Design a protein around this nucleic acid. Structure first.
Length: 54
RNA sequence: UUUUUUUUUUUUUUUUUUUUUUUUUUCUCCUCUUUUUUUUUUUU
């Protein structure tokens, strides 16, 4: 279990997409929670063309 | 000078069967009178 306290936004997302890529090697599922509508779809768009299905 | 968030119309389909109209009651029952019975025959 990891807690992160930093300042840059995308810098914290590296471990997030590390876990996301790690799930498909484990065949499990992951949930991403974004408590704002604009950011909720930006990560989906970022990871759609990047890999897999979101 | 009034921001931000609260998903939606149950899943399933590629199961066998070798009979035949109907169907099941009603009891014994005083017949009145000119008769033997006439008769061939011919014209259809």
């Amino acid at each position: 279990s990891v807690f992160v306290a930093a300042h840059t936004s995308a810098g914290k997302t590296v471990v997030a997409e590390y876990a996301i890529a790690l799930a498909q090697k484990h065949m499990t599922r992951t949930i991403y929670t974004s408590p704002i509508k604009a950011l909720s779809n930006q990560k989906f768009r970022d990871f759609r063309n990047t890999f897999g299905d979101v």
